[PDB]
Design a protein around this ligand. Structure first.
Ligand SMILES: N[C@@H](Cc1nnc[nH]1)C(=O)O
Ligand SMILES: N[C@@H](Cc1nnc[nH]1)C(=O)O
Ligand SMILES: N[C@@H](Cc1nnc[nH]1)C(=O)O
Ligand SMILES: N[C@@H](Cc1nnc[nH]1)C(=O)O
Ligand SMILES: N[C@@H](Cc1nnc[nH]1)C(=O)O
Ligand SMILES: N[C@@H](Cc1nnc[nH]1)C(=O)O
Ligand SMILES: [Cl-]
Ligand SMILES: [Cl-]
Ligand SMILES: [Mn+2]
Ligand SMILES: [Mn+2]
Ligand SMILES: [Mn+2]
Ligand SMILES: [Mn+2]
Ligand SMILES: [Mn+2]
Ligand SMILES: [Mn+2]
Ligand SMILES: [Mn+2]
Ligand SMILES: [Mn+2]
Ligand SMILES: [Mn+2]
Ligand SMILES: [Mn+2]
Ligand SMILES: [Mn+2]
Ligand SMILES: [Mn+2]
Lengths: 191, 191, 191, 191, 191, 191
């Protein structure tokens, strides 16, 4: 049984995460930031987690505090659900083509936080993905992955090999992180 | 049962493909272009497909029309054999060292055609691999992969990380595409 | 049963290797070069081999002859334990993040020796990792992998994508080679 | 008596080599690739070997598999004929001018395979030498020398100092390798 | 009879050399610097000298004084054993491949000291080869060859054509100097 | 018996050459150009030829016509003395250190004239070596070697690897050509 429920309340946001590592992709995400909900839904589904996230935060300022606090809490939930990590594969990686984009992630569930994020085109440091609700600044992608690795206490390396569309580039990275985790958390039949 | 038989007749060529995704490498290829037969035999075997290809075409002009038409028909056969794609891994990738060459392919069985082919040394845009029969112009490698992805309706990304011999460089790419497909078409035990 | 015992005596060193490909990481290494013992222990464990190495050699000169002779003998033991290679996956690869470092290895158990080692920062050609016993010159990493591939008769491609600490850079490569071998030697359920 | 007979049958080719190191240049070569026959005849004659090679292979694809398999088998025959290498010169080198070309080879019969091939003009990576039979792609020169060194288990270093004509450049290298071997295999009157 | 015994005592070191040019490789070297003993043992053996060297010196400072004084004394012993040089080949050269390294030396026994040492990679000016005893700084290679040429009163040209491992690069040069001397000191059957 | 006597009379010069390939260095040269006499005396001695050259020519103009005509006649004498070339080594090369200079020559007694002369420092295209008699312009070195190769009908490749003094640079090349010829003309005990 590899489950964790994390509640995180700050002046800026209120988060509840329920996570099961051995899920089948039963995912419900609601953070008030719909493009981030979309990315975390991709992450939960492609990782084959069961995952509920409910977050409310100060989106009148912008999405950053809610996005970061949610990734902190999700990271904590992952590190708590992994427990002593006995018997698992520990290493995982995945390539994700998404039309013109190719992204990759590799993970070591080592207990030492580390994140290296490389290759994202420079226009992503000032791109906004905007719809009819609160927008998502793609500069935050790096912060999401760093907050995840820091609080799960894992090494997470995320690379964009190439790509052009900012939604494809973002979504392929969240998917790659998701499939890398899925491989690394699985029981290893030889250990 | 994941099988397709495709017949494609044009003014330029006559093709029959019989494909089974759940094969054991039972492969017979005859296109009149023996180096291409060799590459498609590698592709069928390393993908663990059962695959028969019989093609006749206008090789007095050169191999291009037969090669492209065969890849179009093979692509169509793959997309037809995959059917609704329920329950499969969907993503697959593979590295293939071949002496000095290292190639890689990643696939997303997404239903949207896309191909990105990168890294092949520039001398491959005018190299000929010639024996005692119809020769094979390595410039056509890109067209084969694009025609495969376009007609199977999948994302296919093929990279040459490095290499020198044009037969190794070509053959390592066909093998990589083959092993990437093999992983992506397999049933996924968690979906 | 995929086991080999190799004894190799030269003027410079005396080596005994006992290797089992189908092990569970039962590893004991003693070469007189403690950082190399550490790397070969990583290699045996991450490959899920059972592996005993006992080497004594001319470390008053420096570690090179003992290190190389041991890798030659270990390579021979691998190629002997693999036997006719019937029914195995044959290809294997692995990414290994280790804090700031990311390394990768890909293997083809082809029967033709080949090694390509790329990306290691230039300071590793004159770095020493020194403790209270015989030191380890990281310039030797390349020679270890080449001697392994040459005597097992396999293609081994080892890459450092990036990194800074010489112990992380070294150890991530030995781990990557180890996990790539583990994948490639495994029985392939479809062949 | 320093003789070896090697038979090598693969799906791609059937090879028989009979080699005598202490010959007088009695050489008969028939591989189905007449420019390669010419180069191996040069090699056998300039090395003062007696050498018979008979190879048949899949030249409808192109010459590569027959060429490589023959060099593998010839390498094995050399390493077998050298036996324990007692009493020989061990090191050998030779310069070969051939009109505008100057090539060189150096050998160490060390028991550790190694090949370094440098200086060949870049146009040789896509040059074809074509007559009325199966052609020879000069990109294969490097692969021939590497396969020879790998299977004889010797260090072979081949350099083109300069040159322009691809037949002179190729033939001067095979001659240089041949004369370097001839010197290195000879009995050394002081050991 | 071409023999010399040289004793050289300084405040820093005490050296005894016994040299025979017409030897069979009977070599015993003990200087307190085991990697240097290894190189001088290579030099004596590959030159087909009989050579005893016994040196003790101030290795608490470092190896330099013992290494240089020994090469001075060995040079003097060579120049004394050559005597009037009547009837010898006088010129000698040798290429030495050592895995990835290729080194070369040429000699003229002219009676005028000269040394030109070129091609050694720049990292060798600050590389240490260290084991469990006194280490060897590869910056000293040049000084060894210069001291040898200066005291034997010969022209000695040592080149590294290419290479990477500092032990291979060093050892291939000492071997090349050794085989070049062996050729040059031999009786010339036509003079 | 490998001897030739050549007389060559032109409006510009009168030459007599007597050459024996199987000599012991009995050399007498008198051309009216004393530095050229010195170089041809080096050439005859280091080649172990017996060689008499007596030339008189229009040195009031400068040395060029006498120097070139003598090299033409000497070349003709070499090609005539070699006869059918049966049973000889055919290939020869030699390195010649001369203080700071290192030169090299390689020869193929092929019956096709060819000369490639490379590496000589650019100041040699306008250097004069002057004493109390007729001077020698070092620009002529290339013409001497080309005239030798053209009239003996051999491939001659002469290289200066490095050097500074024009007399050392010149003399080391003539010596290298001489020792390369000496090796190439010798009977080959295996053919
Ligand atoms: N919410 C955290 C971190 C943060 N605040 N603004 C942007 N990032 C804090 O208040 O320090
Ligand atoms: N066969 C197709 C595509 C094609 N024709 N020549 C090269 N490529 C056509 O006729 O358009
Ligand atoms: N031990 C082997 C290889 C080697 N020696 N020094 C460094 N590498 C030999 O003696 O040739
Ligand atoms: N014949 C060998 C090597 C090779 N195949 N194509 C080019 N080189 C094999 O099948 O792996
Ligand atoms: N031993 C000699 C030369 C030397 N001293 N330190 C480094 N080299 C001397 O005392 O001058
Ligand atoms: N002596 C020959 C060649 C020559 N003349 N001046 C420089 N070189 C002739 O008259 O052509
Ligand atoms: Cl990659
Ligand atoms: Cl050279
Ligand atoms: Mn923040
Ligand atoms: Mn989307
Ligand atoms: Mn087309
Ligand atoms: Mn092939
Ligand atoms: Mn070594
Ligand atoms: Mn460690
Ligand atoms: Mn090949
Ligand atoms: Mn020819
Ligand atoms: Mn000093
Ligand atoms: Mn050594
Ligand atoms: Mn002229
Ligand atoms: Mn002089």
């Amino acid at each position: 049984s590899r489950r964790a429920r994390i509640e995180r309340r700050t002046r800026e946001s209120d988060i509840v995460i329920e996570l099961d590592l051995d899920g089948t992709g039963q995912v419900a995400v609601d953070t008030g930031v719909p493009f981030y909900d979309h990315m975390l839904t991709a992450l939960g589904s492609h990782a084959s987690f069961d995952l509920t996230v409910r977050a409310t935060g100060d989106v009148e300022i912008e999405a950053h505090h809610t996005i970061e606090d949610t990734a902190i809490a999700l990271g904590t939930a992952l590190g708590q659900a992994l427990g002593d990590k006995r018997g698992i594969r520990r290493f995982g990686d995945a390539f994700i083509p998404m039309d013109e984009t190719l992204a990759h992630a590799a993970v070591d569930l080592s207990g030492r936080p580390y994140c290296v994020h490389t290759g994202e085109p420079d226009h992503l440091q000032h791109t906004t993905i905007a719809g009819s609700s609160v927008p998502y600044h793609t500069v935050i992608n790096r912060h999401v992955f760093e907050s995840l690795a820091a609080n799960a206490r894992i090494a997470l390396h995320v690379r964009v090999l190439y790509g052009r569309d900012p939604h494809h580039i973002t979504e392929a990275q969240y998917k790659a992180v998701a499939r890398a985790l899925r491989q690394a958390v699985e029981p290893d039949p030889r250990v």
